[PDB]
């Protein structure tokens, strides 16, 4: 309802702007008519013979005209005052909030709202400002025909014109946005990480959708424009865009989609995966008596030469987007900041919920929180970038371990994870406390903390209670035989020297077959 309230308030302001410019149009029409009659009466005074009354009327008409000129000017000033407030809300609040929601969406957060509500608002205020500029030129025509000392039109014409242009320029400039961030179509859930020699796509949109602008604005893509790091950062790489750098905006939405774009290197405080670049977009509105430069940038992008570097590059996109709300902090990794657990936990859950149909619960995250922060884990605990992706927390880094787990789930364990069969992230002590006091064939599925590759293992309790675990299963084992088949056909030698399946009940208390029967190949 909070969102609705803001929306309805803006809708109201936009309606006020539209209505106000219509009122002025009607008032200006009446003003022209009064002036024309005033002109008539002044030229026909001689004919009247009835002369005194007519002379008195002429003075009254002047007064009415003066009052109406003052009234129209006052209304325009008020309209411009309302317009500024409304546009500032659209630009500095709503659109800023949409761009933030786009950052989150790129990194697995909740989906972006469609732009059409903001398009409607931006277009109405634009149409209104266009009309005002026409209204000011009509007023100037009236002034040219007739002007007096202390004429309101003469006194305010310069400022009213300057204000209106400044507002229109700001609104159309702000309406130029990156609707869809750069992304390789072959890696759709991995945006802002671009591989050299591969095709990528970016979409631009002008929120002010004016029919006259259709097919007229030509957008040019530039790589690393005004990037001081190419000078200040030693070893900074340089690239060129292959493919067409230009696209006309067309309508519905007035938009420009760049397909078939490609990056090629040119013939070290920052590593490749931490180096941040920018795509800039430029166009210009040119009309008789009207020129406006329009520019916008993408969010920072990481450029890689090998697919192997994609998980690391992704980690850097996640860090930036989670911690920064700016489009151009390209020196972010020179001195990277730390993240609170609360933010990281949400993002980590997002990773799972984007790749699979299931995210991470409090229990799984508490386990992970302890791996990063220790037994003292709090939601306000700070995790350094070096602890997330660079240092070996064991012989390996944390994000690489998490990633290899998500690729195992995607390629081999999707239905089990989605259905809730895998506990996955549980501490040894926690596993002990859940498993003990349970039935003799109780087991749980979880991921290995000692395996860099990404593995899965099961731990079962037995009455002497004794605990037992299996050597972990990597992708190689999973490719040959599915994991539900492994669970089904697992055998340990019993005390009677006969093979037996110790796996009887999935925690808390579910028959192996009921839980995994659906996934058995045979």
């Amino acid at each position: 309802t909070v969102m609705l309230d803001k929306q309805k308030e803006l809708d109201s302001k936009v309606r006020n702007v539209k209505d106000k410019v219509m009122c002025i149009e009607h008032e200006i029409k009446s003003l022209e008519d009064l002036q024309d009659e005033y002109d008539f009466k002044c030229k026909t005074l001689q004919n009247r013979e009835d002369q005194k009354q007519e002379q008195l009327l002429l003075k009254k008409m002047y007064l009415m005209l003066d009052n109406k000129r003052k009234e129209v000017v006052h209304k325009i000033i008020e309209l411009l005052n309302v317009t500024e407030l409304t546009q500032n809300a659209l630009i500095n609040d709503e659109l800023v909030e949409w761009k933030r929601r786009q950052q989150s969406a790129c990194i697995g957060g909740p989906p972006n709202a469609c732009l059409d509500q903001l398009q409607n608002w931006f277009t109405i205020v634009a149409e209104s400002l266009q009309q005002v500029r026409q209204q000011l030129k009509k007023l100037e025509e009236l002034e040219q025909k007739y002007t007096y000392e202390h004429d309101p039109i003469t006194k305010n014409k310069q400022v009213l014109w300057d204000r209106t242009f400044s507002l229109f320029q700001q609104l159309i400039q702000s309406s130029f946005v990156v609707e869809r961030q750069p992304c390789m179509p072959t890696h759709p859930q991995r945006p802002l990480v671009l591989k050299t020699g591969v095709q990528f796509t970016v979409k631009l949109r002008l929120l002010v959708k004016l029919q006259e602008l259709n097919y007229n604005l030509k957008v040019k893509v530039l790589f690393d424009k005004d990037v001081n790091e190419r000078n200040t950062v030693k070893g900074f790489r340089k690239f060129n865009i292959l493919g067409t750098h230009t696209k006309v905006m067309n309508m519905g939405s007035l938009a420009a989609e760049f397909r078939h774009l490609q990056l090629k290197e040119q013939k070290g405080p920052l590593i490749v995966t931490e180096e941040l670049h920018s795509l800039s977009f430029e166009t210009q509105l040119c009309q008789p008596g009207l020129v406006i430069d329009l520019e916008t940038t993408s969010l920072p992008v990481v450029v890689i030469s090998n697919v192997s570097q994609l998980p690391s590059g992704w980690a850097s996109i996640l860090w930036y987007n989670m911690l920064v709300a700016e489009p151009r902090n390209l020196s972010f990794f020179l001195t990277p900041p730390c993240a609170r657990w609360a933010q990281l936990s949400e993002v980590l859950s997002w990773q799972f919920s984007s790749v699979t149909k299931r995210g991470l619960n409090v229990d799984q995250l508490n386990m992970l929180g302890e791996k990063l922060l220790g037994p003292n884990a709090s939601p306000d605990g700070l995790i350094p970038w070096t602890r997330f992706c660079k240092e070996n927390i064991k012989n390996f880094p944390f994000w690489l371990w998490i990633e290899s787990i998500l690729e195992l789930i995607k390629k081999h364990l999707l239905p089990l994870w989605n259905d809730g069969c895998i506990m996955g992230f549980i501490s040894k002590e926690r596993e002990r406390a859940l498993l003990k006091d349970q039935q003799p064939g109780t087991f749980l599925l979880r991921f290995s903390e000692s395996s860099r590759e990404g593995a899965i293992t099961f731990t079962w309790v037995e009455r002497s209670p004794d605990f037992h675990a299996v050597e972990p299963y990597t992708k190689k084992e999973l490719s040959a035989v599915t994991f539900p088949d492994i669970i089904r056909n697992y055998k340990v030698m019993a005390a009677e020297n006969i093979p037996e399946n110790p796996l009887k009940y999935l925690y808390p208390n579910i028959d192996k077959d009921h839980a995994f029967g659906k996934y058995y190949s045979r």
């Binding site: 675990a469 299996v470 084992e477 093979p499």
Partner: peptide
């Protein structure tokens, strides 16, 4: 302190691990 018995994919006992 508790111990968990480790079994390979075949089922053979591979040892035990100790935790605190």
């Amino acid at each position: 302190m508790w111990s968990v018995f480790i079994h390979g994919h075949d089922g053979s006992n591979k040892g035990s691990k100790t935790y605190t």
